[PDB]
Amino acid sequence: SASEFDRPLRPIVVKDSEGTVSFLSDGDQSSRLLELVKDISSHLDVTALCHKIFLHIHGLISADRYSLFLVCEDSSNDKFLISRLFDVAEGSTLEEVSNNCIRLEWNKGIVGHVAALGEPLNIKDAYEDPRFNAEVDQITGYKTQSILCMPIKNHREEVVGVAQAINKKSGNGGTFTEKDEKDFAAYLAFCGIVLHNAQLYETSLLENKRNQVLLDLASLIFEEQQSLEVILKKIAATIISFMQVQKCTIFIVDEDCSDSFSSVFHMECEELEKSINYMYAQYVKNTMEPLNIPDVSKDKRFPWQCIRSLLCTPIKNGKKNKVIGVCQLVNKMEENTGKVKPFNRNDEQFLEAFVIFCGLGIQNTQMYEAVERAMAKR
Amino acid sequence: ISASEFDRPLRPIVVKDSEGTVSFLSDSEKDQSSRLLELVKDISSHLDVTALCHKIFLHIHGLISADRYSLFLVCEDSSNDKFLISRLFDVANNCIRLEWNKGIVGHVAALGEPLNIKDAYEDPRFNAEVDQITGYKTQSILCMPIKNHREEVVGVAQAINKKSGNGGTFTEKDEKDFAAYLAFCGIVLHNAQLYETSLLENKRNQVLLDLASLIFEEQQSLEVILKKIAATIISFMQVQKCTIFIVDEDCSDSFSSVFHMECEELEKSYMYAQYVKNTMEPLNIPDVSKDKRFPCIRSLLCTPIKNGKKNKVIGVCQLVNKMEENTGKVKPFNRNDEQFLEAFVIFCGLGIQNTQMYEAVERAMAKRN
Structure with missing residues (x-):
């Protein structure tokens, strides 16, 4: 989990030349x-x-x-x-390095x-x-x-x-x-x-x-990659886990109405996992770039337990243009405290790499559900 | 970008666990x-x-x-x-x-x-x-x-x-x-x-x-995907021929069918696979003409494409003639070459596996049309 990675490291991922986006760095x-x-x-x-x-x-x-x-x-x-x-x-110890x-x-x-x-x-x-x-x-x-x-x-x-x-x-x-x-x-x-x-x-x-x-x-x-619900759970579970956050919430841009959101998947961090505040999702879709907010009761962009720190990225597809969904992490927690810090570069940097595959997978899951909807037309 | 710039000793590229599941978490770290x-x-x-x-x-x-x-x-x-x-x-x-x-x-x-x-x-x-x-x-x-x-x-x-x-x-x-x-x-x-x-x-x-x-x-076609796979493997690994065999979906000791690319490009569509299919394990023949076969194909890497739970053999991958660069000279495979393929096979696994399921509905719909 993400918090022993918390010194300064190189990007996980690297652009070049209207950056097509890549993993592979360089007495x-x-x-x-x-x-x-x-x-x-x-x-x-x-x-x-x-x-x-x-x-x-x-x-x-x-x-x-x-x-x-x-x-x-x-x-x-x-x-x-x-x-x-x-x-x-001098002669006086529990242990040494104590x-x-x-x-x-x-x-x-x-x-x-x-x-x-x-x-x-x-x-x-x-x-x-x-x-x-x-x-x-x-x-x-x-x-x-x-x-x-x-x-x-x-x-x-x-x-x-x-x-x-x-x-x-x-x-x-x-x-x-x-x-x-x-x-x-x-x-x-x-x-x-x-x-x-x-x-x-x-x-x-x-x-x-x-x-x-x-x-x-x-x-x-x-x-x-055969059931949307199936796959989001693993993305959601897997993140909340590694990122030590409190909620994760995936929004799927609708495939036909290229505006708004067909499905949505939430998850609190004591594990339950089922299917109402779209503002950041819609920003980050329309803006097409990530959103990091150390805390929202101090951000002049968005009319103001509860939602302190937000790091909310967008899932693009293959060929790298349509935003196909969005991913909203909420409330990174200091490790063993439970205090609530803001997402730092690490967390920004892992997520960025993660949702590349989140993309690929969601995109191909969708394909599958697609074909499945063909078959049930006779 | 060549398998061959990685030809020294490295950490195990994968750890496999008490019971199937290969992880990439390697060196206990x-x-x-x-x-x-x-x-x-x-x-x-x-x-x-x-x-x-x-x-x-x-x-x-x-x-x-x-x-x-x-x-x-x-x-x-x-x-x-x-x-x-x-x-x-x-x-x-x-x-x-x-x-x-x-x-x-x-x-x-x-x-x-x-x-x-x-x-x-x-x-x-x-x-x-x-x-x-x-x-x-x-x-x-x-x-x-x-x-x-x-x-x-x-x-x-x-x-x-x-x-x-x-x-x-x-x-x-x-x-x-x-x-x-x-x-x-x-x-x-x-x-x-x-x-x-x-x-x-x-x-x-x-x-x-x-x-x-x-x-x-x-992942919308077994034909597309194996091209993508083979193409990269060939350049990356520096071999002359990738052949991907896919086990019969239906049952079972067959081979549904078979991409095979050589190292300039596209025209496609036979023992060795077999043995791996059955063994369930990598095959390393330095000299292809000195084993248990009777016989170009001087040098053989065959790796098994496993599956989800890593207990069935979805498919098989094989390549021919590892040839050091600065040369062209053919040449056997070594631990490096096995290891990279050991890994690249996993995803290939899920890759394939997942496309299969898709065609399994293209093919449900070719019972009507």
Whole structure:
């Protein structure tokens, strides 16, 4: 389902030349340093690679608590760091990676900001920092003294990661060295590269999986193109499922009266599945392009549980001109919340590809029902 | 766009499940001590295998000092038969290709040990045909293996003929400097390959995705549709003849009838099918004239078009003479070639199947008229 696909990926489908539409795209530290870079260099797996980095910074330079952060980016290009790899309280755990996951939005927090500016930070007293949040420090009676918080960038200087060290170990009540930066920041510069390769590889693995899904759904709907009702159910069921939405509603442009709608098929997302607000359908037919509305109680186009976010595409046929039906998704839901987000590019992008086959299939189902209506004229 | 640009090892194109149903969800998935680093830094950014090679090529230049330099990339086809290829080769266009244990290099490949060669005209493995034709004298030779981290050999690089005052061998300490840098190339090389295989696994999904939009466009005639099918299969797979057999609708060990296209276009309308029909499984005959048949038709792929629930055999697909491009030369089928057809057959299944049902009403209506 659609929500592990929610970083930025390439289009599923591609136009060319009044785009006919297609799928097919186109000394003895220096010494040590090395031994390390070898050790990461072989990891393409971000989880795996992240662990190995976290491990590495540890004996990289001397302090009390370390933290790694990984930049992320949903499909709407909104970014943010998360970390499950967090030094805590010292002999004291449910589990390690404790089911449990920090997440800073972009530019908030000491790290937030390191990120968003991509310059390192060598604080001597955290409490002097206006972006230190002392809530944790307070509740657990740790004393956060000194902070090393450096960005990790890929070769193009993009920030992919932040990593910081807290409270330099010391028996002279000390700070983080100029040297101390360097060693830490050297080793990171390698990470930013290796890591970035890791992200790009995992994007393709995903980019794949998405297409495998698409192929499976392709086979599914195509199995039984003999009853409109039959086939819409599978389109409807299959979508509500993968898209995590609340309703789906297919409208079939009528084959004779090329204006209005002969059949209509609805489906709520606790499964029931049977046969009254045509405004968006008629728009998207007459407009012939998709409709994405983050929420309708704020869209000046359409006289205003209930219908917040709308992503409503049109099904064209073969030869790619007549809109033959329309598809109206309603109310994407944040995964396990049930909150209600707006459809982002992902969802737009999958649907677009999906209804190409939705088209083909509905069109040929209709053919069948056609011939069947011939036979019952004698 | 040819089956043949996908001829390396890939994930299973389909998983079949406890009981019939093939899915596409596959792979269960979501000092120069300091001077070296400058070098490692520079390659590690690269996931393009070309671009990463060109880079390794340069580095090795500044790394040991020798007259002619070359770097060799291991390769691999659906069938797991490794060669080496190379387009970076000081002769100080064209692309070398060595089979697996041939040559010096192909030997250091296959043994993945280095050869440090003091005079070349002594090593058995050497041959002077080329020195001779061209007037070079090969002399000393450092040939080193490039391993990724699991110690497997992904490439070979070599340096021929030291530059010296005293006339030089290749130093106990040149070997090291080299092997060294080569360790890193191993690992980066490997990932870059890994990346591209992925990239390739996805271009595959879009070939299918495409050549399914193609099929299910109109399913209103068994004649139309098999043309569309065969036509594409022939170009895609690079064979001379597609023959689609459709099992008798009615009952059952017959063959209703039969499209057959060869590879220029349209004129249409005989054992081999049979065997698949009955077995229910793909058939791979390298040489068609050395099996269980008695006999052009040198090479045979026959795949069974199954059906809805994937337990009956709707139909059968067969092709003749896989012929590598750059040639025309005929040639057997391999895992790639099976796999793509294994997939393309599914949709073909539903494709056909669904057209059948339509004609089953064209033919209900030819009982009146």
